[PDB]
Amino acid sequence: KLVDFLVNVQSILNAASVKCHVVDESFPAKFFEKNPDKIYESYCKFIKNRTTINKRFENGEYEPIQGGFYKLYHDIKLVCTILIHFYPQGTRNYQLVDKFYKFSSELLLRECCRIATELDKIISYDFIKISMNYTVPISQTYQIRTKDMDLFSSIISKSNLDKRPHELPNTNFKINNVLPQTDIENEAPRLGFVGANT
Amino acid sequence: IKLQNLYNWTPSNYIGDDEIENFRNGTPDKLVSDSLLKLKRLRKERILNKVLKPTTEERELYFKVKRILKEVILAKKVSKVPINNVRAFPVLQTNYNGSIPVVR
Amino acid sequence: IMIDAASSFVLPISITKNVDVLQRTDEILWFRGPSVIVNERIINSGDPHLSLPLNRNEKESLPGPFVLGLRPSAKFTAHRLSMLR
Amino acid sequence: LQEQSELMSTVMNNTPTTVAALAAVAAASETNGTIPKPRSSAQLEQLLYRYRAIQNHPKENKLEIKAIEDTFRNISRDQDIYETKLDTLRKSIDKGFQYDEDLLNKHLVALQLLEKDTDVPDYFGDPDTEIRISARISNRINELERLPANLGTYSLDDCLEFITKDDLSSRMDTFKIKALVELKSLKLLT
Amino acid sequence: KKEFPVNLTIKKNVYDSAQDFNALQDVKKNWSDQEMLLLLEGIEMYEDQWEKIADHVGGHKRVEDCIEKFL
Amino acid sequence: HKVYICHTCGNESINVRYHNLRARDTNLCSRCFQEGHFGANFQSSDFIRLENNGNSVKKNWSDQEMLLLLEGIEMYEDQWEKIADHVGGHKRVEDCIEKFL
Amino acid sequence: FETMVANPIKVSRLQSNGVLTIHYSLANF
Amino acid sequence: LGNGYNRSLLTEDYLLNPNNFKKLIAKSMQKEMQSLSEQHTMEYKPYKNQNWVEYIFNGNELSQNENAFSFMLQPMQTFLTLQSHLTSSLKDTETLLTINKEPVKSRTITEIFDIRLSEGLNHLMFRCEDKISHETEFMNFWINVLP
Ligand SMILES: [Zn+2]
User: Fold this and answer.
1) Which residues form a coiled coil (chain H)?
2) How many angstroms separate the CA atoms of H55 and H103, rounded?
3) Reduced to 3 states, what is the DSSP secondary structure of residue A4?
């Protein structure tokens, strides 16, 4: 079960890396094995102080245990943080690493599991709350106060592992956070509504 | 009043079987051929009556036919049980209004 | 209710020095309203966290949003990447 | 007077205890013409579970609970009748029959066509019958006009594309175009 | 021969109307879209073994229930 | 080849448009449809992904060509010049009527 | 910067739908 | 970087719906949800059909170079209320809220406001400041109430 589970992950990450070549990047040992929140600060320590991800499977660095897929998680996150800081934020390979990181993390998060408010004082008094919660990373836009137009911008495609300071092409820009809307969907109207007889 | 004979409940078990045990001692496929002709004839009488809903006599007869072929796949384990699928299925997708406000 | 509103505006000052990430005209598009962030497109219309059957106060911190998105297994994707070539 | 649907209306409105259909000889027996032994798998059977679980608290104002619990004995009997009958079926199977594939091909195809009410070939003027054609055409238009507009697909071939969190795969509208060619050609027939 | 094609994946079932797809409906026998995806997935992989597909679905559906779904 | 200018901006759709099904004469880029810049009136369900590239050898009649033919007869009810470019312009007048009948 | 009224980008719906991309049809010298 | 310019004031800001929208309809499947920007969990609780969503803003780890926020409200949800849990009213902390330009006074540390929104965008410019310490923090909520 876990033997194919190393092979099926490996067969995807080689074939899903032809346009971006993250897996064939020059990657040293980089033995941190720390908190994944520390995975760049220990690497920033590694830059100040001083075997690739394809060759990690080939050297058998990854065992059929959680730690063998934790190092598989640790070494992948090290390469993408190298490649995000290498490229500027507008190049195609910056977002190609950003697209490959989001896919490979989504591939590793699953399949290892297979193997104070007056409104709340009324509703919890009135209802029974079966609950479900989760985390989501939001994006940002710009905010411009022009002459009563109150302009907005598009979504900046800066990755979540960029960690660069807030530069501004204009200081009269304001910056706003776009909260993502997620719930049960409002019921779409029927097919007679969309495509009626005109 | 039981529980697992009360939660495990389909429309294909209210009749029970009452005919297939006698017929499975011989061939099982002749009742498949003779009842789909009754399903086709009753459907012809449904189109020629300007009616839409299926009768209770052919719906109860429909779950008889699916129970025959299932046990041949279950126990006899037919050498193909042929897979001809469209390899797709309809799912609901999310919808959203635009964020640019309306102009009147 | 009109349809032909502009909703896309361009400031005349060419500030295209640090702007390679945003949406350009080919100048910067400045819309009338903000953006819409959607988590997942395909919903899982089964999955009894959402279906709510009428049989039998509990919380459940599910792992991420990817439970409700219909993803396939890597075993078949390896079975399909072997079906690739 | 739709006694099996008024319980669904009381369940969907989340108030099946404030009225509870007011079961007497004038109300519980008027909408029934003993409960009429509902037909669905669980869409009308899980209703009677919650209807009894709600009427466990009054337990005496509603005399129809004896009529509901009698069919609870009949459901547990006919399941037990079938579970002995399914067991006597699985022993009455001849150890050799060798079910023919090309008849099972004709049995898998003809069953799938007869499920969703289409004409099956055998291979085994006159305005009276003009209304009986147009009553099936208008049957189809009113069935296509109840599908939701946000219909999407999922093929088994998207795993070679490696769709990200927001990638907009190009196979999402391979069912939505076919449902609108069908709905609009059924209006341009004249 | 030019024939109008039959669209069975859009057609709702008439005799039962409870084994339709979950977008077309308006142990456990619920059969969510995940196990419905894993059913055709193991059918594409294991090709009607009904036991390698029964645990590729995820165990909550019986072998008879995979054959009841496949029909 | 046609050009398909994106609605609610001035960008050009490269090879794929999101044709509105209630405005029925507007197209969108993927980016203008991803962030919901089509105005708060439309519900993102009235947007069929249509393509802008030239199709295969003729008398094939893909469902994009079939629906865009079916939109025009609901739009115009005549003027098969105005139907043939609505299919994409790579189909003759003599073929769409030969396809419709 | 708040006296910097921007340029509206008009779509002109007929240009959005079907504009194609004359001496090259040689019948006009 | 503006994360070192975090908010000294403004512990919690609640954008809960009023009980008037509940009591005029109701007389539930809870779905908490948090965002990966270190703060502002957005919990909500619909039922099979009202929602009564709630945008809480625990502004202790929120920045002040990023003052504005943006979300979208339903056409049924045009009313909002604040619950401005500050750090402390050590002085007369001035909490004003111009929805676009219109100041909302209060309902009457924790100050409750009465926000009624119109369709389309809203500024909802909220701020706190102290007279003596002379330190301002800004809150903007680009609320696009749906038609
Ligand atoms: Zn565009």
Assistant:
1) none
2) 20
3) helix
E strand or H helix at E58: none
Q: Given strand C30-31, what is the order of strands in its sheet? A: G7-8, C8-10, C30-31, A151-152, A139-144, A174-178, H68-73, H136-145, H125-129, H94-98
> How do H68-73 and H83-85 pair as beta strands?
unpaired
Cα-Cα-Cα-Cα torsion C22, C26, C28, C32, nearest 10 degrees, comes to -100
What span, in angstroms and rounded, lies between the C-alpha atoms of F7 and F18? 10
* Cα atoms found within 13 Å of the Cα of residue G24, Cβ hemisphere only: 0
In units of Å, what resolution does this entry have? 7.6
Report domain extents, chain D.
1-190
Task: Name every chain D residue with its beta carbon within 8 A of the beta carbon of C72.
Answer: 156, 158-159
Neighbouring residues of the ion ligand 1, judged by CB less than 5 Å: F 6, 9, 11, 29, 32
D184: phi then psi, degrees, rounded to nearest 5 = -90, -25
How far is it, in rounded angstroms, from Cα G17 to Cα F5? 7
Mutate to test the interface with C, among E33, E38, E44, E52 (most CBs of C within 10 A): E33
Give the DSSP H/E element, type plus range, for residue D129: helix D128-144
Contacts of D39 (CB under 8 A, 6+ apart): B11
Q: Is the CB of residue H126 less than 8 Å from the CB of residue H96?
A: yes
- Backbone angles phi and psi of F3, in degrees to 5: -120, 145
Do H51 and H93 contact (CB within 8 A), yes or no?
no
Report the distance separating Cα H107 and Cα H123, nearest Å. 20
- Per DSSP (E only), the strands in H88-131 are 94-98, 110-111, 114-116, 125-129
Sign of CA dihedral A165, A169, A172, A178: negative
Is D159 in a helix, a strand, or coil?
helix
User: Which SS3 state, helix, strand or coil, does residue C73 take?
Assistant: coil
The DSSP secondary-structure symbol of E52 reads H
Q: Does D189 touch chain B (CB under 8 A)?
A: no
Q: Which residue, chain included where needed, has tokens 């939001």?
A: A138
Question: Taking a C-beta distance cutoff of 8 angstroms, is the pair F11, C25 a contact?
Answer: yes
Chains within contact range of chain G (3+ C-beta pairs < 8 Å): A, C, F
F12 CA to centre of ligand 1 in angstroms = 6
Q: Quick one: tokens of D85?
A: 């009958």
Residues D153 and B19: their CA atoms lie apart, in Å, by 41
Q: Residues D31-47, buried b or exposed e (16+ Cβ, 10 A)? A: beeebeebebbbebbbb
- The residues, ordered by sequence, that sit 6+ positions from C83 with a Cβ below 8 Å of its Cβ are none
Q: Pairing relation of β-strands H42-43 and H54-58?
A: antiparallel
Residue/partner pairs of D93-100 with CB below 8 Å, 24 or more apart = D93/B24, D93/B28, D93/B71, D93/B75, D93/B76, D94/B24, D94/B25, D94/B26, D97/B27, D97/B28, D97/B72, D97/B76, D98/B76, D99/B28, D99/B29, D99/B72, D99/B76, D99/B78, D100/B29
Residue D85 near residue B16, CB atoms below 8 Å: yes
Measured between CB atoms, which of C41, C55, C76 is closest to D49? C55
Which residues of chain F does G16 touch, with a Cβ-Cβ cutoff of 8 Å? 4-7, 25-27
Contact present, E40 and B85 (Cβ < 8 Å): yes
Find the helix or strand (DSSP H, E) in which B92 lies. Answer: strand B91-92
Q: Which residues lie closer than 8 Å to A139 by C-beta, 6 or more apart? A: A155, A156, A178, C35, C37
Indicate the burial class of D88 (C-beta count within 10 angstroms; 0-12, 13-18, 19 or more): middle
